[PDB]
């Protein structure tokens, strides 16, 4: 509120709102936003000569193809809401079926987080909850990307996950800390961050950064657009120039490292 703006090196973005008690109106309020993924396009659009505006999402979190219809950013792109689409987006079999993807720039996948006793997806503990000890719980945020992938290979675990579904991210970690859950499953690109900027390094990932179903993050564009060749080539060029390492360090810090 000093000047009704925010400091330089940050891009404004028009966030929608659902109005006050849905009585009337609902104000498109200008509030600038920053982060990692937004920073990369700011430097990117200095060599392809873009002009851009941002507006955040309306409904859902990422998307799901249910009843032969889509909603989410993937839903937005398939109906031409925006030519480009950035942010936390996961490349997968179903997603690439309808919309094209670029070359990924950061590697990731899925992982498990526990407090302070098993080997992984084949561990016999995960196989059946019929052991002597009382059953433990999973985090497994619904309506996500992993859940659709998890359903694909073996079902009996997911119907167990249906009984207990976590909400949000921060709400899940405190529940694990208190002892409401015991095995949180989510993508690794963010769990390593949360374990890093934490208190006491009490939370870790299993093994030496063990990863399952390695996957990359990238930018999705509309099918058949001529932007494909240029956006691919430019994104690859910054990787060679040693820029990803520098941008990673600032927004990927290690306290427990």
């Amino acid at each position, epitope marked *: 509120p000093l000047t009704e703006t925010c400091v330089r090196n940050t891009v404004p973005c028009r966030k929608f709102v659902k109005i006050n008690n849905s009585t009337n109106e609902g104000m498109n309020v200008k509030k600038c936003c920053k982060g990692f993924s937004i920073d990369i396009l700011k430097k990117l659009s200095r060599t392809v000569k873009f002009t851009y505006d941002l507006y955040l999402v309306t409904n859902g979190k990422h998307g799901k193809k249910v009843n032969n219809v889509w909603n989410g950013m993937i839903g937005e792109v*398939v*109906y*031409q*809401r925006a030519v480009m689409a950035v942010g936390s987006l996961t490349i997968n079999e179903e997603r690439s079926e309808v919309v094209d993807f670029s070359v990924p720039f950061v590697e990731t996948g899925i992982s498990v987080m526990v407090s302070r006793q098993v080997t992984g997806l084949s561990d016999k503990k995960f196989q059946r909850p019929h052991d002597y000890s009382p059953p433990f719980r999973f985090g497994t945020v619904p309506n996500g990307s992993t859940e659709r992938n998890i359903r694909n290979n073996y079902p009996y675990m997911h119907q167990y996950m249906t009984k207990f579904n976590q909400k949000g991210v921060e709400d899940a970690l405190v529940s694990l800390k208190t002892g409401k859950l015991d095995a949180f499953i989510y993508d690794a690109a963010v769990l390593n961050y949360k374990a890093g900027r934490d208190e006491g390094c009490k939370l870790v990932t299993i093994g030496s950064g063990y990863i399952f179903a390695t996957t990359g993050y990238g930018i999705a564009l509309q099918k058949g657009s001529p932007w494909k060749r240029q956006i691919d080539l430019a994104l690859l060029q910054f990787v060679g120039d040693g820029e990803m390492e520098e941008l990673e360090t600032l927004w990927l810090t290690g306290i427990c490292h």
Partner: nanobody, 117 residues
Framework: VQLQESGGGLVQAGGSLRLSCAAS????????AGWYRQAPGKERAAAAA???????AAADSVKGRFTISRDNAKNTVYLQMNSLKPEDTAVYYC????????????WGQGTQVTVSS
């Protein structure tokens, strides 16, 4: 802003119609125009779209039956529909979004299209 839809009626299966939605505005170059369908017992569904750049997307469900067009000179978007089937019986709606504004979902009174023997 306010729009207005028209063009409905009763037409035998395999026939054609020309629905139309129009609105008043001095900036009419830049609005997404979309067609929505909502039959009794089913949720609202997208049918056809037109982008600001000038690209056309058609839903795969009833792909090829109808076609979309927009006139930059005159503020009206009319939907040319052909080879009617009973599966298309519904009330079609027109909408716009973005280029300013707020509370962004805009719906006309509605035009009912009836396909039957």
């Amino acid at each position: 802003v306010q729009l207005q839809e028209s063009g409905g009626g009763l037409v035998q299966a395999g026939g054609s119609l020309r629905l139309s939605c129009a609105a008043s505005a001095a900036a009419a170059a830049a609005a997404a125009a979309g067609w929505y369908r909502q039959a009794p017992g089913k949720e609202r569904a997208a049918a056809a779209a037109a982008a600001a750049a000038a690209a056309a997307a058609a839903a795969d469900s009833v792909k090829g039956r109808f076609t979309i067009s927009r006139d930059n000179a005159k503020n009206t978007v009319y939907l040319q529909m052909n080879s009617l089937k009973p599966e298309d019986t519904a009330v079609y709606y027109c909408a716009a979004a973005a280029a300013a504004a707020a509370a962004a979902a805009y719906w006309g009174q509605g035009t009912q299209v009836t396909v039957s023997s």
